[PDB]
Amino acid sequence: KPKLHYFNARGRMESTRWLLAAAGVEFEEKFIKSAEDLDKLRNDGYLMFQQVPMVEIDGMKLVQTRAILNYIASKYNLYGKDIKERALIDMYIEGIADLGEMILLLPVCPPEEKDAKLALIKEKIKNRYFPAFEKVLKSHGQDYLVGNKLSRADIHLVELLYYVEELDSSLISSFPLLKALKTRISNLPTVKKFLQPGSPRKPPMDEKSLEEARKIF
Template identity: 40%
Template sequence: MTSQIIKLTYVNGRGLAESGRMIMAAAGVEWEERHLADKSEIEQLRKDGVLMFEQIPLLQIDGLNLVQSSAINLYLANKYNLAGKTAAEKATVNMVLEGAKDFGVYGTIPFYPKESQEKVLNENKKKAENRYLPAFEKVLADNNSGYFVGDSLTAADIVVFEKLLPMDEYLPDLIPAYPKLHIFFDKMKNNPNLSAYLSSNKRFPQPDDAYVAGVLKILYT
């Protein structure tokens, strides 16, 4: 009996699908991708009724058509035992996931007008320093296992790591200022499955003007 193919449909870049990709990579599972290249393709998906809210990413898995990145992440976390072991751990994983989602804005900076990108980056640097990075540091210090929740890898670790990566591309001096977070970041980079993913052709480069133009054409024009 052959295993069911997992299929991810999104645009040709990181975006809202990247955290799901990294959860699957960390879990050691394979998936196929369809990259939309034209507005007519997403319109057809809407007509087909597989997009509950007419948005992507779309993850087709276990006979389900999953949309909304948070729902996709939670499904994958539960399916691959990365959601926490107890009710309390599961709740903490969810809290960290929501905080990471609010924090993870650095991948959107190329979508701002050129003249405002530096301002947006500086504003989010202040938010990172005043709110998110100290919170991440405290959670790691309080848990004292090297992970955000419990004593083993969870989706909380994976998604925080995924959101830290683009920040580190823009602001490489920030993470080293937080000792626990710095150790965590290096450990995640050295995770065999994540390291293999980051060096593979499934990992997209930092968004550029061509990517931005393509996304706008497919989703917003």
């Protein structure tokens, strides 16, 4: 079974946890706790660019978030049925990854920049990204973003809705089809299990967890 190499936090590994869980794939995590443990991976040759996330799957030592996700999504048939469907999915999820990146990097922003950056994130959520995805759902009326079938785009989008809810639960309120997608995907057996207590799902990053990160990089 796949072995996830990261530290005990959401970070750049959480979207992989979500996708594996949603595909009903059991995995182990081998958590890094120290710079000592990170250097073990580097000197043992496990990290091509000396960086985690790293996933052991099917014989490979995959680094780079998007290489991991792209491989898992094709393997478990959540990458669409042809390259035109993969292009819609890719366009959707990279928009998601652009917004996700902004939110992921808020706590490490310079303190004097944090007010502006948070404000900017909310403006783009409301005016750019949520209308973009509401218009997709409104355009075909179906229960899934692409191909009328569950795909990584639904998983990645619903994951981001949970992080937006944590930032401001009002932001999704004007977007009914996103609301309904969030509940429908949340109530899929594998996702509902992942959302319940005691799963590998990781909490928000507090301060102590934040520092113990900088102390490893």
